[PDB]
Write a protein that binds this ligand. Structure first.
Ligand SMILES: CC(=O)N[C@@H]1[C@@H](O)[C@H](O[C@@H]2O[C@H](CO)[C@@H](O[C@@H]3O[C@H](CO)[C@@H](O[C@@H]4O[C@H](CO)[C@@H](O)[C@H](O)[C@H]4NC(C)=O)[C@H](O)[C@H]3NC(C)=O)[C@H](O)[C@H]2NC(C)=O)[C@@H](CO)O[C@@H]1O
Length: 364
């Protein structure tokens, strides 16, 4: 099994216990690490990060410590959107420039591959995304035929939502071109929804109130659908979140599907109404009531008018058992810098969530 771990370049600006740098990375924690995110300037790959050159130092230390560790570079993410890939994708000339810059950049800086996480192609960018991936795949393969080093890996963070999947992807082709997908099996529910009701960020299974299309909004369905569409199960690396989605409750009802007036109060460290990192969640749970959903196989917690749907150690072990049953490629984490990486907040040691995933994957 793979354990694929995204980390981010904005977590370094947080205060403790959320102040993360690549030096917080345990080189034996994960099989793959993925830096989030690179940029594109003048159709070439760059890293925009005040700490860029220190990142390279840590990459080299980590890979020296653990010769098996793979470290990939990611382009994309929600904020980058589709706009970020233009004008690079607009022509084969500009795409060739990009692809050539990637190979040189990854080799120069000791990266093992590229993750393309286009959020999201949809109908409009379906062709652009398909060709980009295919051209990258071929170039990497070409490079390999000429090289003494391993072939550069190619992966993609992909939607777990059935409609977005149908619109964005040509799955059989993707299966040939990608080494694996990083299934983004989270953000199923949240304070952007209308009607504005509580719902879990990342339920494993369908809710008792779900019927029809709402029956798609869970991890088991997403996984099954990708397989159905032609992605081999062992190329499905299943995303698990270390964050939760929060709601401010509109009434006294505290159940799933209860009315919400908006996102929950911002965490003190992440300062973004609507989500909480796990290290903030452990502080939230103090004085909260926690319910484990038997239908959906994940917890939520309520304190005052605040409702948080999140993933804990029980969820980690339950989702790992699931991915193993379905013969998936492994687990992916978004993101390790939102786990309690210092261990100072949750009283469960360093990376309590990710370590549980690791322990569960390694268990016979
Ligand atoms: C609105 C919404 O929730 N949409 C989701 C979308 O976020 C999902 O995108 C994937 O999953 C994760 C988890 O949501 C994404 O993480 C977010 O990524 C953005 C950057 O793209 C983060 O923005 C950062 O925000 C902090 C906090 O305000 C700022 O300080 C930073 O400057 C800013 N970073 C940058 C580069 O500008 C945001 O905080 C992340 N949120 C969380 C909770 O971590 C991630 O982008 C994306 N994952 C991958 C691998 O591409 C998407 C999944 O399908 O669904 C919805 O569209």
């Amino acid at each position: 099994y793979k354990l694929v771990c995204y980390f981010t370049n904005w977590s370094q600006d947080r205060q403790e216990p959320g102040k993360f740098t690549p030096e917080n990375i345990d080189p034996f924690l994960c099989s793959h690490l993925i830096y989030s995110f690179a940029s594109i300037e003048n159709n070439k790959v760059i890293i925009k990060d005040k700490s860029e050159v220190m990142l390279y130092q840590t990459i080299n230390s980590l890979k020296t410590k653990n010769p098996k560790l793979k470290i990939l570079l990611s382009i994309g993410g929600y904020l980058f959107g589709s706009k970020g890939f233009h004008p690079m994708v607009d022509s084969s000339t500009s795409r060739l420039e990009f692809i050539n810059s990637i190979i040189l950049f990854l080799r120069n800086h000791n990266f093992d591959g590229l993750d393309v996480s286009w959020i999201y192609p949809d109908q409009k960018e379906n062709t652009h995304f398909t060709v980009l991936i295919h051209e990258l795949a071929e170039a990497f393969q070409k490079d390999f035929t000429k090289s003494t080093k391993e072939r550069l890996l190619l992966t993609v963070g992909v939607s777990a939502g059935r409609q977005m999947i149908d619109n964005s992807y040509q799955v059989e082709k993707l299966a040939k071109d990608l080494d694996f997908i990083n299934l983004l099996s989270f953000d199923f529910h949240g304070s952007w929804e209308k009607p504005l009701i509580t719902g879990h960020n990342s339920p494993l299974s369908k809710g008792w109130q779900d019927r029809g299309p709402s029956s798609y909004y869970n991890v088991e369905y997403a996984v099954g659908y990708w397989i159905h569409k032609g992605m081999p199960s062992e190329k499905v690396v299943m995303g698990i979140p270390t964050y939760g989605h929060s709601f401010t409750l509109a009434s006294a009802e505290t159940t799933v599907g209860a009315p919400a007036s908006g996102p929950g109060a911002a965490g003190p460290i992440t300062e973004s109404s609507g989500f909480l990192a796990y290290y903030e969640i452990c502080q939230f749970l103090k004085g909260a009531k926690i319910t484990w959903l038997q239908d959906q196989q994940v917890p939520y917690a309520v304190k005052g008018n605040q409702w948080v749907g999140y993933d804990d150690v029980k969820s980690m072990e339950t989702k790992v058992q699931f991915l193993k049953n379905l013969n998936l490629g492994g687990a992916m984490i978004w993101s390790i810098d939102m786990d309690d990486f210092t261990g100072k907040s949750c009283n469960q040691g360093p990376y309590p969530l990710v370590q549980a995933v690791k322990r569960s994957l390694g268990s016979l």
